[PDB]
């Protein structure tokens, strides 16, 4: 009932936890997110995400699908800007069969010409569906506006590339980024000796391996949604800095979203700030993204098209308040309780815990128990929070919007 963690000579982290539950769940996490694409292979990691049931050396495309379904299985693939994660769930008696599959897909895909060719239109489908959620518009643009290089890359292949990702490119991406050095093999409901064993033999992939440069920019998308999404961010702090915890707390001061169904959000600075003047449909939330080597911090509005000027300003002003001192301890206590509570809740599940343990394994090289985390959140000073707010107001801005942007301001309109 304790997390066991080991690192191999070759750099591969292994974490497990025998909780003797009826279900077993294994993740292979990989420093292989969209940030690792260059201007020449854009979209490759997207295709790679979609491609997990193509034929491998060890099992046919048919065998992966039928074999996993036989036993009530699930094989699944997640990407952020920085990581990819291959997860298998099943009943505990069959982890053997699923590990076999997981190792095949990550260790020896074949990416046959005809299968890859065939999968190409899926790029468009998966992308098209994704872009239905207008948050994805704004957020992907936002990253593109903010950075010039890696974190700039969108997670979904750009149109000009759909049809045009090659077998060779898929191969290169895997061979170059799926290396022992850049993987974490996480395991809930299995024995740690057996994970070590598996990783020693089967994840022995010879280590085949720029800082993200935030520049600041602005990207507008005209349509006629009549609701305008906008995000406004400044450079923040990377994960693992105590600055990072400062921003996280500032996020929860300003308000990152609702705690009550149909809520008024009495406790959200931002929400009440907007609402003191504009009395119609809107939403607002602090945005906080913290990456290996950078971070974005700010807020996101959803306003009427006509009201976006009035809303974005009202929101920005609220952050200026914090930056110029106005923050009670009541407020910062509320913030920390929220963050503390929300953290613990986010690791309530098998899903959430696995993601956290694997996440940390890559990012640091270690496990931080929830107790220590809470200490680090308690350890943030109201001065640190006022500093983080100061940092945003004064820092160089990146912005992205979409909607009928008639009354949506440019950065240089404050």
């Amino acid at each position: 009932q304790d997390l066991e963690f080991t690192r191999l000579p070759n750099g591969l982290v292994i974490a497990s936890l025998e909780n003797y539950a009826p279900a077993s769940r294994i993740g292979l996490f990989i420093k292989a997110g969209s940030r690792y694409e260059n201007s020449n292979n854009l979209g490759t990691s997207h295709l790679l995400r979609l491609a997990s049931s193509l034929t491998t050396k060890g099992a046919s495309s048919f065998k992966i699908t039928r074999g996993i379904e036989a036993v009530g299985g699930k094989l699944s693939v997640t990407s952020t800007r920085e990581n990819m994660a291959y997860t298998v769930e099943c009943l505990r008696d069959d982890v053997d069969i699923l590990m076999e599959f997981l190792l095949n897909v990550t260790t020896a895909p074949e990416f046959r010409r005809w299968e890859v060719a065939a999968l190409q239109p899926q790029l468009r489908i998966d992308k098209a569906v994704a872009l239905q959620n207008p948050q994805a518009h704004v957020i992907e643009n936002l990253h593109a506006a903010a950075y010039r290089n890696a974190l700039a890359n969108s997670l979904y292949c750009p149109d000009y590339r759909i049809g045009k990702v090659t077998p060779v490119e898929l191969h290169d991406y895997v061979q170059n980024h799926f290396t022992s050095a850049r993987m974490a093999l996480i395991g809930l409901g299995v024995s740690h000796p057996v994970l070590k064993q598996v990783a020693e033999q089967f994840l022995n992939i010879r280590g085949g391996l720029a800082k993200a440069k935030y520049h600041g920019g602005e990207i507008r998308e005209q349509n006629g949604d009549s609701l305008v999404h906008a995000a406004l961010v400044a450079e923040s702090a990377a994960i693992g800095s105590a600055e990072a915890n400062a921003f996280s707390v500032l996020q929860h001061v300003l308000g990152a979203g609702p705690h009550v169904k149909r809520g008024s959000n009495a406790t959200s600075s931002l929400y009440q700030a907007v609402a003191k003047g504009v009395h119609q449909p809107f939403d607002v939330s602090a945005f906080n993204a913290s990456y290996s080597d950078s971070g974005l911090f700010g807020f996101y509005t959803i306003s009427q098209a006509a009201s976006a000027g009035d809303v974005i300003k009202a929101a920005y002003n609220q952050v200026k308040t914090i930056a110029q001192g106005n923050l009670s301890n009541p407020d910062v206590q509320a913030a920390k309780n929220k963050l503390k509570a929300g953290y613990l809740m986010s690791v309530e599940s098998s899903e959430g815990f696995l993601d956290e343990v694997g996440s940390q394994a890559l990012a640091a090289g270690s496990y931080t128990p929830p107790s220590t985390v809470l200490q680090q959140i308690d350890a943030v000073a109201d001065a640190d929070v006022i500093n983080a707010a100061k940092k945003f107001v004064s820092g160089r801005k990146s912005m992205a919007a979409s909607g009928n942007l008639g009354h949506t301001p440019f950065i240089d309109e404050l």
Binding site: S76, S79, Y156, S285, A289
Partner: peptide
Amino acid sequence: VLCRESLRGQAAGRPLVASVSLNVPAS
């Protein structure tokens, strides 16, 4: 969307995570 109630909880604060599966819909 035609009301604050329904609209709220849309404002993003998660940098995005794309997840696609074998036998579970994409998100």
